[PDB]
Every structure is written in C-alpha cells, then in structure tokens.
Design a binder for this molecule. Structure first.
Ligand code: FAD
Ligand code: FAD
Ligand code: FAD
Ligand code: HTL
Ligand code: HTL
Ligand code: HTL
Ligand code: MG
Ligand code: MG
Ligand code: MG
Ligand code: NA
Ligand code: NA
Lengths: 585, 585, 585
C-alpha cells in the first residue's frame, strides 16, 4: 500500500541498472543512506574518503561503460567537493547523476546549520539542476534526471531535502522509465555525399585521416582504408588504441600530447579527412592553415565546420561512413608520401625504443613505461592522471583495440588517476587495471588509495615522482621571464603513503630495479592493490611542438642543442624522408 | 615609463599589506606566477598540494587577523578546487580574494583546452565576480575586488586571461586605494535604550546573557556584568574563550556542540540578553520557546529580531553597550538562580574531569584533550576540523582571552584543520599552533601535511582515529531505521602518512602512553611540525541535547541507561540544584 | 586586406540566410548598428518600440520557418527587455540568436554608466552564453552561437563590448560554417517494435491516437490510420490544424484549452498511442490514470516514458513510424467506440455552431471568431496571444494543413500576438495574417502596433475587449475564497490606440455590426494593417474540464446551472452515446 519515497528512489536506480554509486554520508543525506542500507544486495555503495573521488569515479564509470555514473555529497561542503568530477563529466560529455543533501523542508531558508540555497551552486555544471520539494514526485524527478543525463550526455543534479525520502508515498504510483530506453537506429549516409568525399580524399597528393573517439567503433575500417589507399593515420590523444599502436602508418597525435610524425605530416597535408574529432587546439595552433581541402564526418550537427572551414561535411555515424568509403575503393600502389611517412614513423619508434631500452642508471619515465608494458595484459585498462604522464603514456604505451585508457580529456583535472582506476576495477573485476599518475596528481587524491584497500580493488598504482609539476615547469621555461615558481617542491614517499593506508608498495630510483619490482607488483595485483613509487629524473621530454631538426627551418646551433637535450641525435626531420622519396615541402 | 600589468597587480597586493598567498600554478596563471617570482622578498608565495587547502588557509588568515586572505587556482580544475574554502569564507563572512586563471583573450570562447566561461562558476559564492578584459584596468579591478571583499566581508573573485598580466601599461596610471582604508568611528548607544534594556534584564528572575563572537572585544565587560549582577553566561561555540572557561558561571554553549549546563539553563530562563549572536539553531531547536523577554544587541540591522521576536533590539557595538550597562548597575546579592547554576557547572566540570583523569587503559578522546591541555602554551592557537572534535574540544580545551580557536563555523567543511594551522603558523611564527582533526577530516587534506614540512611550520597535528565518521554514525543511530552505512571504515595510520611526507610522528592507543608522546611533540614543535595519531574508542560522547537525568522528565529505565552509557552516574539534572536553593521549573 | 569585425559579423548572419532582425540601438551597440547600416541592401533591420517585441518576433520567425531568429538589445535595460521573448524561445525550443550591447573593453568592470557584468543575466535562459573579448575571433563566436542554437534548438546569447566591432581584422581569416549546416539525423522505427505496437493498438476496445506537433509532417497518415482502423484522433492544442478540423473523428484537445469530446474520450480510453507529444498536463491532471496500455513514438530519448510508463516506446520519426503502421493494416469494420465518439463530436460541433450563428445582440467572442472564419483565406496565418483567446480560437477557428497558428505554447507569455504577426507578415507577405489577442495581452505590446504601420505590414489585428483578465477571473472563481481581485479593470479603446499609431481601425460591440466591419478590414489589409476592437461580454466560455451534464455524476441543480450559463441545453455527455451503442460508462 505505501513505500518510503527513499526506497522508491533506490528502486529507480536499480531499474536503470546502476550497479554501484559513491559518496560520503551526512545528516542532510541520511534518509537516502537509510534506503541504500536496506538494498546492499542489489546496489553497491562505495564509501570514498573525499567526495571529489566519488564524482570522478562516477564520470569514469560512464567513460568506460556508457552507463550513467552515480555519486552524492551531503549539504554544503559534501556537494561542493563533487565539482572537479562533475566538470569532468560535463567537459567529457558523459552521463552522471549527482544527489546533493539538503536540510529538511521545515528548516530550509531559516539560515540554519550548513543550510543555504544550494540550487545556484550547480546551475553552471549541470544539464538538469533541481531542488526536490515533494516526496510523491521524488522518484519521477530522479528518473527525469537519469533520462536527461543520458539524452544530453551530461550532469544531472538533484538537491534533496532530507525529510522527503523518509515520507510514505503510495506503493503503486511511482515508476522508472528505464524500460523505454533505447539507442537510435541511424540512417545510412547518402551515397552521393560519400562518393564526393571519397573523390576528394583520393585526388589528394598528401592525404591524412585524422580521427577522434567518435570513430571508436571504426578501428577495422580505419586501418583497412589506410593500408588499401596508402593514407597515413593520425588521431587525437584519447583516440590512441582505436587502431593498434603497432600499425606502421599510425603517426600518433598532434600538438603537445603528441608524437613527432603526426605534427610533421599534418603541416604537409593537402587533404585532411577529419572524423569523429573535436580537437581543441585546431584554431589556436593553426593546425590546418596549409590544408587545401578539409573533409568532415561527424554525428553532431553542432560540430559541422566547427574547427575549420569545411569543404564537405557529412552528418553521419563514423563507422557506417568509413565502411561505405571502403566499399567503393580498391588498392592503390605505394606512393612517395606513404613511404616518407612510414620511414618517419620507423625513425621515431627507434628513438622511443632507445629511451625504453636503457638497462642501468638514473631512472627516467621512459623505462618506467617500458616496465608497465612488460607486465601489462593485452586487455588492461589504464586510468591516467594529468601532466607529463599523458605525453609519456601517449608515446610509450603499446595499446590495441582490446585496451581501454581514460583521463580527464578536456577539463583536465589532476587527481583522476586513483578514482578512474577504482571505477575500472569495479566495472571489470577480471581485467588488469593501472593507475598511472604524476606525484602532483596522485597527492591530490592520495587518501583514496585507502578506498582501493577497503574494497579490495587490485589496482596497480604507478606514481611518477619528479618532485615537480613537470608539465607546468616546462611551460614556465617557455614563457616566463623570471625564475621557476611553484613547480619544484618537496618529496613525498608514496610507498610510505601506501603503507599508511595498508597497501603493499615499492619505491625505485634506478633502471635496474624495475624488472623485479614490476614482477612482484603483477603478482600482488592478482588479489590486492599495489603501489610503485618511481623516483624519476627531471629531464624534459622531447617537445613535439618545438622540433629543431630541419636545416631549412632552424639554425645549426638550435639543432645541435635540441639533439643534445632530448637524446635526439638519430632523429631525422620529415623533410629528409620527403626528399628521399622525391618530394618537396 | 611602462610596467607589466602583472607587476602592478602584485604592487596592489603589497599596498594592501598582503603578506602571503596560496595556490598552484598552471599555464593559464603563469603570468601572475611570473610577477610573484620577481617579488619573493616582499610577498610570500605558499605552494599548496591541493587548491582547496589554499582557499581554506586564505579564509583562516582572515579569521585570525581580520586581514584579507588571498588564494588562486589555474583555469578550470584549479579554480573549482577552491570552492570549499570560498564557501567557508562566504559563510564565515571573512574577506578573501581569489584569482582564477583563464586562457588568453585570443583563445577565449574558441572551445580550446581547459577553456570555458568561468564567470558563472563563481557567481553564487562571490560578493564580487568578474572576468578582466583589459591590462590597463587590471590593477584597478584587483584593488576593487579587495576593497569590496573588506567592505562586504566576503569573497571577491577575478578571472584573469593569462595574456593581460604580460602586457605593458603606463607606469604612472595605476594606483591602490589601500591608503584610504579605515575602520568606522561608531556612535555610542543611546542612554535611553540601554537603560530600558538594563531594567528588563535586572527585573528577570532567571536571566542569562547569551553572546556570540560579535562580543569578542567585550570579554572583560561580560564577566564583570555576570559577577556583579549574578547572571550566568552562555555562548555560541565559536565564542568559547572570549570569557575564560575557568569562570565559574560560564555555562558553555547550547544544542549539540554544547555543554549540559547551558542547555538546561536556557530551557529555564525568563529573560535572555542575546548579544553579537547569530546562533543558527535558534528557530529549528525552539531554543527560546519558554523565554519571556528577548533583548538583543547587534551591529548589523539585518540581524535585528532575526532569531526570535525581540522586545528590545539595540543597534550598536557589543563592547560599548555592555560597558554602558555596566556603568549604570551595581552589586546584587547572590540569588537561588545564581547558586543553582554555579552548582550545576561544578557538577558538570567534575564529570568532565573524571573522563580526563583516567590514567590507564583504552584511549578515549577525553584524555587526548587533557594531554593537549597539559602541553599547551597560554596563548596557543587551535585550528579545529569538523566532527566529534568540535564537541570534545568545546568541552575539554581550557581557553582564555589569550587563545584563538577557529573552525569552519557554519559551512562546516571537513578538512579545515590542516590549512587553518598552516595559516595560523604563518601569521604567528612565535605562537604554538595545534591542528585538532578527526581521521575523516584529516584524510581529506592529508597531502598538505607536506606543506607544513616544506615551509617549516611547526604545527602540532593531533588526529583522532576512531575509524568512523563519528558525528554521522551517531546521527544515523538517532534517525535511521536500517543498519549503519558509510560511517565505519578502514584504518589509516597517520604516523605512516606523516613519515611519507617527512614529518616526525607518533601513534598511540593507550592512556598511559600520552604523557611521554605529548612531551616529545611539544619539544619537536619548537622547530618542526609533528603529528600524533591517537587511536581512540568508539564511545559516543554524552549528548547534551538528549539528557536523561531528570525523574520528572524521563523514565527511570531511560536514566539508568543514559548514566551507564555516558559514565554519567554522578551527574545531576539542573532541577536538583533548582530545588536545593528553593526554586521550581 | 582588412575588414571591420562588425562587417565580418554581418557577413556571418548573411551566410546563414538571415533575412531580417529586430532591436533598438544604443551607444553600447552602435558599432553593430554601423555594420548593419552598410549592409542594408542585403540584410533588413526591423526597429521595434520595445525590445521584448524584438525577441518575441525573433522566436516567432523560428516557429514559422525553422530559420534562426535574430534580435538584439543595448547594454543593461535593452537586453533585460528581451527576456520574455528569449524564455519563450527556450520553452518552445526554437533557435534564437540574441546579441547584447556592452561598454568597450577599456571601460568594463570600471562601474561606469549602464555597465555591469552582463553574462550572469543570461545564464539561465541560454544554451550558449558568452561575452566576446577579441575582435578577430568575434565572427567565429557568432558562427558558433548560431550553430549551437540550431543544434540544440534554443537560445544563444553573445554580449559584445562595443569597441570590438570597430576594430580591423584580417579580411581572409574569418568564415561562416553555414555551408556545412545539417539538421539532426532522424532515427528509424524498429520493424518488430512497430508490429508489436500495431497489435496492441488493434487489440484495444477503446483506442485513441493522441499526437502533438512532433507529428506535424504526418497529417495524411494520422487521418488515414484513423479512417482505416476506426480510431478517433485527439491532439495537443498546438497540433490543431495538422489534421483538418472538419475531419469527423477529430475530438480536439484535452484539459482547458480543450474540447469536450477529447476530455471525455481520454477518460474512457484503454489504449493511447502518444506520438510526437509532450503534453505538460499529463501527470498533474492524471490524464492517463485509467489507461491500460501506453504506446509512445518520439524522436527525443529524453521524452520516452516521461509522461506515463510505456508498454512500447519507439525512438523514431513520427511520420515514418505512422506510415509503417498504416502499411501493415487494412480496413476495419466500425465499432461501438467509434460510433459513440462520432456522435459526441457532432453534438459538440452543433453546440459551437449555435454560438457562432447568432445574428444579433451583445457581441461575444464566439461570433467574432465566426467573422474571422468568414474573411479568412485557406492559407491564413494566426498569431495568437495568451488567455481566453487560446481556448476560443482552439474551438472556433476552422484550420487545415494549409494554415499556420502560433502562440507562446509553454512559457505562455502574454503580448506575443503583435510580434508573432509582425514576424508572420515579414516571412509571408502574400499570406493573410491575423493577430488575435485579448485586451490584457494586446495592452502589454500595444506600442508595436506602430511597427506594423512603420513597415507597412498588413496584419489584421482583432482585440477581444472584456475589460478583464478573463482567464484569471475564472481561475479565481474556481479557487479563491474572497472576492475577485486584479481581474477586472478599466476600458482601453484600441480603435483610438490604433488611430494614435496611424492605423485604420473599428470598434464594435454588437453581433450585427460584424459582417460589414470585417469586410472592410479584409480589404484594408490588402495594403495596410487594420485593427478591430471587439467589445465582448464577460460570459465565461464552457469549461471542458468541469462538465456538468451527466446526471449519474452531477446534481440536477449543477446540470441546470451549467446548461443555462453556457447555453448548453442541447449538449449531451459522452455516456449518452456510449449507452446508445451498448457500452457502459
Ligand atoms: C594534459 C592534457 C593535454 C592534452 N593535450 C592534447 C594534445 O596535445 N593533443 C591531443 O590530441 N589531445 C590533447 N588532449 C586531449 C584533448 O584536450 C581533447 O580532449 C581531444 O583532443 C579531443 O579528442 P576527440 O576529438 O577524440 O574527443 P571529443 O572532443 O570527445 O570529440 C568526439 C567527436 O566525435 C563525434 N562523435 C561521437 N560519436 C560519433 C559517431 N558515432 N560518429 C561520428 N562522430 C561521432 C562527437 O560529436 C565529437 O565531435 C590533452 C589532454 C590532457 C589531459
Ligand atoms: C560540527 C559543528 C557543529 C556546530 N553546532 C553548534 C552547536 O551545537 N552549538 C553552537 O553554539 N554552535 C555550533 N556550531 C557553530 C555554529 O554553526 C554557528 O557558527 C555559531 O553558533 C554562530 O556563532 P556566533 O553567533 O558567535 O557567530 P556569527 O554567526 O558570526 O555571528 C556574529 C554576530 O555578531 C554580530 N556582530 C559582529 N560584530 C559585532 C559588534 N562589534 N557588536 C555587536 N554585534 C556584532 C554579527 O552581526 C552577527 O550577528 C557548530 C559548528 C560545527 C563545525
Ligand atoms: C494559455 C494556454 C493554455 C494552454 N493549456 C493547454 C491545454 O489545456 N491543452 C493543451 O493541449 N495545450 C495547452 N497549452 C499548450 C501546452 O502548454 C503545450 O505547449 C502543448 O500541450 C504541448 O504540445 P506538443 O506536445 O504538441 O508540443 P511540444 O511540447 O513542443 O512537444 C513536441 C514533441 O514532439 C517530439 N518530436 C519533434 N519532432 C518529432 C518527430 N519528427 N517525430 C517524433 N517526435 C517528434 C518532441 O521530441 C516533443 O516531445 C496551453 C497554451 C496556452 C498558451
Ligand atoms: C594540464 C594542466 O592544466 C596541469 S598539469 C599540472 C602538473 C601536474 O603535475 P604532476 O606532478 O602530477 O605531473 P608531472 O607533469 O609528471 O610532474 C598542473 C598543476 N596543471 C594545472 C592544474 C592545476 N590544478 C588542478 C586540480 N588541475 C590542473 N590540471
Ligand atoms: C558536520 C558535518 O556535516 C559532517 S561531520 C562528518 C564526520 C567527520 O568525521 P571525522 O572522522 O573527521 O570526525 P569524528 O566525528 O571524530 O569521527 C561528516 C562526514 N559531515 C558531513 C560532511 C561531509 N563532507 C564534507 C567535506 N564536510 C562535511 N561536513
Ligand atoms: C495563462 C496565463 O498564465 C495568464 S492568462 C492571463 C490573462 C489574459 O488576459 P487577456 O485580457 O489578454 O485575455 P482574456 O482571458 O481574453 O480576458 C494572465 C494575466 N496570465 C498570467 C500572465 C501574466 N503576465 C504575463 C506577461 N503573462 C502571463 N501569462
Ligand atoms: Mg610531478
Ligand atoms: Mg573519525
Ligand atoms: Mg481580457
Ligand atoms: Na585530498
Ligand atoms: Na508595453
């Protein structure tokens, strides 16, 4: 006859298939806690040590599975702690439900303890942002929040006065709309548009296909188009792994979390096929300033001709359109453009291999990542924090379609490594999970290493300890007139942090220590989380956006300095390969 | 002839006497970093490990000194990390300037990396909230922000596109208005109002003076009025210390961070003088429902008759008005009301002493606080986190006018213990500083123990490890139908956390360990920070808002249970003393 | 080599096919005005007399053509005057671009004249809401705003510091992405789901098809499905006209802007096919409380299961789905349900005809609408204000697929009659255009009758002068305990208002005066606007939501009073027809 409104809210979550949710309790959210407590069998509550980790792990759930992530915070400071996770979900356009505690309706607007108007707090981050005021409609408001988060690929926020979830409502009135949920059946792209686009791509002398994560289902088509047509591939950093890194004509990504061949080739390309791509550096870096024809495939009308004046923009699914292109083309013989790029890639990979293959001496990030590679399972998931690690992981990890990797792509909040890995292990208990974090980002969320312990989540945490905000030190070196400030700091020993949260850990500072430590960690992570604190050097990684290798573009002094600093003596500029196969710039 | 707009901004900060500021650098704020770097001698930059600690320490600066606190965060996630500190400053009504990084004006609104419209983020927390768009007026905007933060006692926020602080502006144009800054000369309260108010207070049979921190300058007048007129004193929790805790007619505070005599007496009072007080539980707890006459002294017109229907509300300075009352009254003989309260206080203090004076056995919070008392200097400053520690510190610390104590009073964000203590030691290098934190709150900001080490801030950190959100577990016990959830969790060993950040530390779990550990910590904190991790029991502290001691109000079974749980066998209800001196309820 | 940024911005509007735009100039928007002035041969500026009319007309443009509407207002009060039209655009989900004046960047944040942080003002209404800060990127920010407004079907607001449009930018860098524009892809109906839906619909004893404007392309299919399957049709009020009103099994709309047969049939229906419909009354009115099965077709996943739990939900285009149902069914025999409804419709229309067909006496709204019908061209466009006119026009206008009618559907802002008619005449100079408005709503925007005169826009304005807010008077009658207040007021002679703005006009107060006045108006509007001020009675129109005709449900006294008041002696309840064909109510 009656049901507690709170019990009904949990039944809405269960109807939408929410497996786990994150938060920290408080008096202002104890009636939702009370309903969760009764439903421990069907929905798994994960108590975090800081609510931002809950919000970031919710976003990561959605990044990994496509299913809505769920978090909560108590009134006032519980909810405002969510913000870095919620902005991450907004900017990374993944569905997240955030519940916010509120004082009961009898005390709202009385200026009582921790009581404020919480609605304006969430207005900017949230696609849907409402304070519930009635128990009977509360299940519907939760259902509405979820349906909107999914439909609009963003954050829904609901402030809940704590009295409402303890009120009885009729048992037969509330429902969830999870049963109506479906994915659309999209039309095929028009043959005429696809044909026009194909002719332009094929007529190019120096073509590139430049994809982002909108092409995540088109890995097969991308690689086969490349091989058949002899057109090199480049991607956004997040799109790494869609085509295996092994692929000899994968150039990497452009800009700064970037690889030399992609930046060089992009500068030379006459035609770019830009697919499922919203590259944020397009305009500011003038990436397409020498491009003759810009062709686009995107599913979102908001993106059409967004990043560059577009000759042909096809509104369509990436995979369907790329498959449709593939169906109308056939073999082209190897071209000088193709051979020049292959040779350029080869030269670049040998450079990266020479960094990895050092056997003895002062530990660098490069050998640490090689050691990750050596213990990694073919379907490992990598949760990656924010800083030099993005650049290093982008160059060194050897990813294929079986892997996943996530970071905070656009909002780029430090601290995501720990919660991303928590979410990954909760969704995929049988898959190996890494957290690769710099010392700055790891220190921001370090308390939640305890959450991995408490819930027995066998994450392999690898902390890169340079005692710097390395990413920012290098920026200051490029722009700042005065001395470094705020970017070099005191050591934290993360093996001791790990010990404090009752997690097994190692600290290493020499290349020769890696094989045995990483072997131990692999084994430990069969049952329990582990941490490796890698004390690395302060060497600046090669800046792919500031290459000094080409005699025609840089002074001989500039080149010798760059080669020295970046151990880059055997790197050749793309122009060398262009000339080799009989082409100019 | 010219000056960098950034250099001028720092000169504005220096003109307003800003000694130190907190933040973490990023590319979007590196031009402000560049100006700070050149001015290291005259303004001290404190690099924190999480920007919320910077914001909380800025609020604490203002809490302690009355001078504007200053913090910053880089664009996107740097600034959103500030939020718990900024809401704390808003709710605690202290002046704070927050600078937010932004992408340069040429890339704003281009949807580039970490670039968004940041202005709506800060609209709710901030009294003044603006995006700067011109270098020439930037010093003025900073000056305007400061002047407004001070005038309105809140948060000013300025988003700064990173190009502006590197632009040249005329050297002679910009100025600071720090030279115009003054405190008002207030009138005296009218004699007639003071007289009317005094007659009503004196005619009462059961008077109380109930002050908050608006009476911080009136400690002397408060205690002398009490002694002369025989009127007991009670305060808000934050107003503890304004009159020495030793004072025999100080009752303590009401509600939950509360002491038994204050709650009991308040329930009996016929007349309350409510001074410099904005007690947020007034209405929700029906604190004044049996009060006959409610008299008020406040400096803010917004507060007049806010918390209860007010018979006489004098708009005036607390000290001036209390001194004016004192000047028109003289000695009254001891009354039964006075003696009953004194006896009630005595009984309560013996109870607290019996908890503190245990010498051997399972460690409780009570003996930990006695150990703090034993090593505390008479002018020590206490930065207090949020949870059971507020209740325990309120009962046990032996404070006088020479002390300071701060917490997050109204927003009540956990994690403030560490940053409050950092700010306290930076403002008062020669004064002993404690951070008293529960394990939940300490774990939220633990990474910034490293900041105390880096800057050689000899804080005494005392962590109360119950492996619970104790405050919330007890709430769940009171309200929740189903089992405890989210409030009991795994151990973190903070002596090992401290070791990881290179801070000397101890862990204790037995009463008999306290004297030697606290003696060592006292000595260590002559030169370096120290941490004591006190593993305490899960005993619930006596709930002053749920007393079961009075035969006329509770069942004999209820009383025996309460006496047993709370080691309260020798506590008597106020009514016993009322009857003793010949009064009824 | 260079172009003024303001010139480039107008070229972006031209590239996007903007024909006309509305607003009022000011110092803060004079550089956009300057650019507009040079471009007066290619884009047409419409000067309004109040900025809300500009914003409202921009919304109506989009409602009519699907082309983004464009309006502007100067800094401060110019922009805030836009709100009612911008909220109208958000709630009716149509693309509008709003440009807001702002002081130059050298004066922003100086607290100068009409200068303020304008961004927070538009945060709630806008899908995209930015302050421009750079001249070179300004064309892109405008291009971005338009593309988002279109993609997201809502409002984009750009605040423009007045200096930027007067700055020179490189002539060759800016572009518009209008060439790349596409409308979102239409999802396809699953064949098996459509088959399941059809079987449930065909098994129904009492089926209804209940469509909204999502089905505006499916009129042919709606009507043919109805005839073939013997299933009555009902619609939301805005969907009136998608199926010709003369169609015998069109019941009308439900709730209050409603027709008796729709409300009665919906109460009895066992199965509802709810298609392209977001009826906001569904839950609050319990429309579907006794519906056994609910079948939904909608393009938007956010709507699926929103208004009732679905038994079958199809995420697909309305016309494709309905075509697919029709393609798999054949002629059904008549059923008792079908006959009962057809007879109820005939009885209802005879009632409305009886009101329209009065030939002399005190003028009522019904005869005015009949006189509109008599002069209306088959493809007339109706801009309808808000109040009793929505209910009356819903019952009396005889519309077909050749007509258009618009109002403020959901925000339901009064005053839209005038601007909507202005926009209608601008987009369709060869079609007859009516503005049908109550005296309350016409009053709000009356000054912009001068805009119809100024631009020679031959609108037929008809004002229904009851000297009341009748819609609200009736609500007060229904709910209020004390006397009417604020709902009856002094006369305004709109024929004199019209005379004042130099528009030909008539005032009538008798039924017999209509034929000749309407003939004259019809003729005048071949070349110039005209106004008819119809002084009507204070008769309440029949409340379709409060029927008192069924003796099984209402007393004799209530039935008699209802018939007498609403001249409804000859109306029968649906149960009469249900019983005739052997079905119990
Ligand atoms: C420290 C740091 C530095 C960074 N710097 C770089 C850098 O130097 N280089 C770099 O490349 N990245 C960098 N990034 C990542 C970067 O900010 C952007 O997030 C990224 O480049 C955008 O990738 P995307 O276009 O794949 O993803 P998104 O921005 O998510 O875009 C996906 C696109 O695909 C479309 N789409 C989605 N589904 C489909 C479909 N089915 N069919 C067709 N289209 C579809 C979407 O509409 C959208 O346009 C960095 C990240 C960090 C943390
Ligand atoms: C976990 C937790 C629990 C808490 N629960 C309790 C509790 O149970 N009991 C309790 O007492 N507190 C409690 N609080 C603290 C509480 O929330 C309020 O912050 C506090 O009671 C308000 O104290 P106040 O009135 O002294 O300060 P404020 O709210 O800052 O008010 C100061 C008042 O003095 C006025 N004023 C300022 N200057 C002058 C002047 N010169 N002359 C005259 N008037 C002036 C101001 O206008 C204002 O009205 C708790 C805090 C925490 C962290
Ligand atoms: C004074 C006043 C009183 C009113 N009261 C009433 C009233 O009593 N009764 C009444 O009916 N109305 C009333 N309204 C109008 C009412 O508020 C709503 O706007 C209306 O009922 C909703 O109509 P709709 O569903 O047709 O439009 P919308 O709310 O615009 O919904 C259209 C739906 O169609 C979907 N859609 C769009 N395109 C497609 C496609 N190609 N295929 C499939 N689906 C598609 C959309 O996703 C959306 O769900 C009143 C208006 C006024 C001004
Ligand atoms: C991208 C960005 O804005 C970066 S990268 C970075 C340095 C990360 O240091 P870490 O030690 O973790 O990595 P390292 O480079 O290997 O030393 C900072 C401070 N920021 C700015 C910043 C500031 N604060 C927060 C919460 N997030 C970000 N992204
Ligand atoms: C007051 C309030 O809302 C409290 S007190 C408290 C427990 C503190 O636990 P700790 O271990 O630090 O202390 P203990 O009681 O001694 O065990 C919580 C979670 N909350 C809610 C809450 C949640 N999250 C944050 C950031 N701040 C608050 N205040
Ligand atoms: C629906 C709604 O919210 C209505 S309908 C109505 C009365 C309309 O009076 P009018 O004389 O124009 O029409 P009449 O009924 O024919 O007398 C009002 C005041 N309101 C509230 C209201 C107030 N103000 C504005 C701008 N818009 C609305 N919708
Ligand atoms: Mg680092
Ligand atoms: Mg605790
Ligand atoms: Mg009217
Ligand atoms: Na932290
Ligand atoms: Na007006």
């Amino acid at each position: 006859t009656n049901i507690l409104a709170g019990a009904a809210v949990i039944k809405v979550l269960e109807a939408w298939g929410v497996d786990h949710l994150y938060g920290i309790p408080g008096g202002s959210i104890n009636s939702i806690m009370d309903a969760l407590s009764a439903e421990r069998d069907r929905i798994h509550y994960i108590q975090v040590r800081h609510e931002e980790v809950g919000a970031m792990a919710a976003a990561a759930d959605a990044k990994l599975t496509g299913k809505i992530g769920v978090c909560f915070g108590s009134a006032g400071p519980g909810g405002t702690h969510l913000m870095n996770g919620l902005y991450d979900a907004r900017e990374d356009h993944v569905p997240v439900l955030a519940l916010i505690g509120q004082f009961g309706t009898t005390g709202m607007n009385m200026d009582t303890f921790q009581e404020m108007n919480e609605n304006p707090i969430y207005a900017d981050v949230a696609d849907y942002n409402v304070t519930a005021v009635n128990a009977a409609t509360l299940p519907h408001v939760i259902d509405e929040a979820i349906r909107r988060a999914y439909a609009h690929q963003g954050v829904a926020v609901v402030q809940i006065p704590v009295d409402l979830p303890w009120q009885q409502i009729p048992a037969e009135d509330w429902y969830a709309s999870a049963n109506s949920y479906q994915t659309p059946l999209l039309p095929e792209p028009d043959v005429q548009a696809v044909t026009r686009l194909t002719q332009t791509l094929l007529a190019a002398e120096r073509p590139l296909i430049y994809y982002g994560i909108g092409a995540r289902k088109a890995g097969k088509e991308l690689e086969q188009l490349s091989k058949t047509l002899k057109i090199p591939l480049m991607s956004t950093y997040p799109a790494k792994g869609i085509v295996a890194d092994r692929y000899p004509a994968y150039l990497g990504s452009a800009n700064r979390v970037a690889q030399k061949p992609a930046n060089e080739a992009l500068a030379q390309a006459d035609v770019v096929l830009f697919v499922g791509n919203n590259y944020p550096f397009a305009e500011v870096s003038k990436a397409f300033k020498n491009t003759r024809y810009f062709l686009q495939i995107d599913i979102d009308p908001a993106k059409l001709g967004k990043r560059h004046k577009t000759d042909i923009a096809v509104l369509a699914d990436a995979q369907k359109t790329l498959a449709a292109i593939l169906a109308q083309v056939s073999e082209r013989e190897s071209t000088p453009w193709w051979q020049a790029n292959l040779a350029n890639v080869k030269n670049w990979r040998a450079y990266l291999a020479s960094l990895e293959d050092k056997q003895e001496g002062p530990l660098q990030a490069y050998q640490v990542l090689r050691a990750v590679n050596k213990i990694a399972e073919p379907d490992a998931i990598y949760s990656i924090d924010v800083g030099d690690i993005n650049l290093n992981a982008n160059r060194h990890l050897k990813l294929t379609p079986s892997n996943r990797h996530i970071t905070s792509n656009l909002f780029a909040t430090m601290g995501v490594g720990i919660p991303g890995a928590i979410a990954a292990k909760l969704n995929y208990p049988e898959r190996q999970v890494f957290n690769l974090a710099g010392d700055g980002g790891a220190s921001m969320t370090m308390q939640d290493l305890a959450t991995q312990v408490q819930y027995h989540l066998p994450v392999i945490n690898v902390v890169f300890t340079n005692c710097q905000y390395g990413w920012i030190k290098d920026e200051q070196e490029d722009t700042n007139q005065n001395d470094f400030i705020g970017v070099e700091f005191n050591d934290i020993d993360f093996s001791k942090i790990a010990d404090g949260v009752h997690m097994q850990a190692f600290r290493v500072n020499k290349i020769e220590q890696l094989p045995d430590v990483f072997e131990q960690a692999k084994a430990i992570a069969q049952h329990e989380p582990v941490l490796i604190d890698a004390v690395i050097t302060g060497d600046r990684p090669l800046p792919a956006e500031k290459l000094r290798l080409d005699s025609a573009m840089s002074s001989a002094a500039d080149i010798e300095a760059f080669k020295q600093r970046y151990e880059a003596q055997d790197l050749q500029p793309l122009s060398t390969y262009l000339k080799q196969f009989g082409l100019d710039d």
